C-alpha cells in the first residue's frame, strides 16, 4: 500500500485525483463533509468552519432553498483558502445527451464550481461519456457509484463489476467510485464511502451506518463522507475532528 | 385488454393515473412530449401548441437557463387548459432522507407544481419512502424506473424484477414504470417508454430508438415519450400528431 502522497504521484493519476491526494496527505485529513443544508449562509459557515478539518466538502445544490451562482463563487473562495475540493452529490443517472446538458446548464451550471460530480452507473457507459464531453474541457473528475449505504442497494455483484469495468475504460475523466469498500485494486482510483458515523444505527429512511475503522481500516476505502454525525453535533467542530482523527488514524495502521 | 377509460376505474387506481387515463381517453392521446429545451419561453409556446396533442407533458427543470416557479405556474395554467399531467424527469437516486429534501425544496420545489417524478430503484426501497412522505398528502404518483433505454443499461434481469416488486409494495404512492415494455401484468399500473422514433437509429451518446407500432403494438407499453423527435422537426405540432397518431393506433390494434 502506498501513502495518499505517493499515490498523488502514480504515472496514471489523473490531475484532480492528485490535487485531493496531495492536500489530504498536507493536512492529515480524509474526511469529507457532507454539507446537507438548506441555506446558503449555513453552508458558506460549516465550509469555513470546518474547512481546516476536510479534504473535500460535498454539496447537494438543489437542496439550497437560496441558491445563487454567487453562493458557488463565494464556495470556492474558502476552497481555495483552506484547501479542499468541491464535490457536487448530483448522482447524474440519465442518458448521456441528457446529463451533459444537467452538467453544464441550467441555473446551477454544476460543471463551473464543482471539481467532482458522481454517477450512476444503470443508463450504461453513455452516462460518463455525456459527462466528460463537459468534464474534460473543464479539467474535472467524475466518481461511479459502484455501491450504496442503503437498506435494499441493488448496486452488488455484477452491477458493482459494471462500475469497475467503466470507471477504468474511462480513466481520463473517473477518478473513483463511491462505494463500501475498495473495490478496485487499482491505486489511481479513490474510494469515497457515506453512510458513516461511530456509533452503530441508521436513520428511518434506508440509511445504514458504519464506522471510519470499519470503512477505512478493515474495508479499504481512502475518504468517508459524513453529514449528520458531524452537522447534528452540538459542537461542530470537535465532530469533524474526531472524524478526521478516526479515518486518519484508520488510514495510518492500514498503510503500517 | 382494458381501454384507458376502463383502466381509469380499476378499483386499486391511483388518483392521478385515473385522472391521466381519463384524458388520454377524452382526448385519443397517449404521448409525453419530452420537452427538452433550454428556454422557458420555447418550453410555453410548445406546452400551449402542442398541449391538445398530448397526455402529458415531461420537463427537466435542471436544463431550464431561466427556470422559475413563475414559469411552473404558467406551465400548469396550460396544463389544467389543454389537459395533460406534468412529468418532472428528475429520476431521483438517492438515501430517502436526501431525495426527500430534493423532491419538497431548494430552488425547483419540484413538489408543488410537478404530478409525476421518477425514481432509479438502486438505493433500495428508501427512496420511494422518501419521495412519499412528500408526495403522499400533495397527491402525487411517482414511476420507478424498471429499464432504460440507452446502451449497456443495467436496468435488466433481476434489476427490473426488483423494481416491479418496489412498484407493488409501495402502491399507495407508485403509479407504473418507466419501461422499453411491459413489465408488469397489473393493469394499475402504467408504461412510459422513452428511446421513440419513428425512423431506426440513436444517438452518439448511447440511445437507441424503436417506434410507436413496436412500443406500443408489440411490447404492450402505455405512453410513448418522444424528444428529439418532435423537438427537432421544424414544425413540432405536425410531428406531434404524427407521434400521437401512430402511438394511439398501435394501442386500438393492441385493444382488437
Ligand atoms: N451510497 C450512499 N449513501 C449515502 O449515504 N449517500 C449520501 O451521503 C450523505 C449521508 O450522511 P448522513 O447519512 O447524514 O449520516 C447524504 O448527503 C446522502 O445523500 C450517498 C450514497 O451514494
Ligand atoms: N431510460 C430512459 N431513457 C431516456 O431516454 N429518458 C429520457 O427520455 C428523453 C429521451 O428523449 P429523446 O427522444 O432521446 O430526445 C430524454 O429527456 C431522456 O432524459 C429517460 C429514461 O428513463
Known amino acids: ?134 468534464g474534460l474541457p473543464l479539467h474535472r473528475g467524475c466518481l461511479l457509484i459502484a455501491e450504496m449505504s442503503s437498506t435494499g442497494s441493488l448496486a452488488t455483484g455484477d452491477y458493482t463489476r459494471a462500475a469497475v469495468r467503466m470507471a477504468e475504460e474511462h480513466s481520463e475523466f473517473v477518478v473513483g467510485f463511491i462505494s463500501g469498500s475498495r473495490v478496485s485494486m487499482k491505486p489511481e482510483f479513490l474510494h469515497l464511502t457515506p453512510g458513516v458515523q461511530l456509533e452503530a444505527g441508521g436513520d428511518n429512511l434506508g440509511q445504514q451506518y458504519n464506522s471510519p475503522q470499519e470503512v477505512i481500516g478493515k474495508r479499504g476505502s481512502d475518504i468517508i463522507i459524513v453529514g449528520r454525525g458531524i452537522i447534528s453535533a452540538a459542537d461542530r467542530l470537535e465532530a469533524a475532528e474526531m472524524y478526521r482523527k478516526a479515518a486518519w488514524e484508520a488510514y495510518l495502521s492500514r498503510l503500517g
Open 1 to 134: 500500500e502506498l501513502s495518499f502522497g505517493a499515490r498523488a504521484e502514480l504515472p496514471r493519476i489523473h490531475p484532480v485525483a492528485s490535487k485531493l491526494l496531495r492536500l489530504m496527505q498536507k493536512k492529515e485529513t480524509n474526511l469529507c463533509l457532507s454539507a446537507d443544508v438548506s441555506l446558503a449562509r449555513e453552508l458558506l459557515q460549516l465550509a469555513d468552519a470546518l474547512g481546516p478539518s476536510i479534504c473535500m466538502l460535498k454539496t447537494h445544490v438543489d437542496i439550497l432553498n437560496d441558491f445563487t451562482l454567487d453562493v458557488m463563487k463565494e464556495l470556492i473562495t474558502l476552497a481555495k483558502c483552506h484547501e479542499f475540493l468541491i464535490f457536487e452529490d448530483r448522482k447524474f443517472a440519465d442518458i448521456g445527451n441528457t446529463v451533459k446538458k444537467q452538467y453544464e446548464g441550467g441555473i446551477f451550471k454544476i460543471a463551473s464550481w464543482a471539481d467532482l460530480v458522481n454517477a450512476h452507473v444503470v443508463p450504461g457507459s453513455g452516462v460518463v461519456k455525456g459527462l466528460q464531453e463537459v
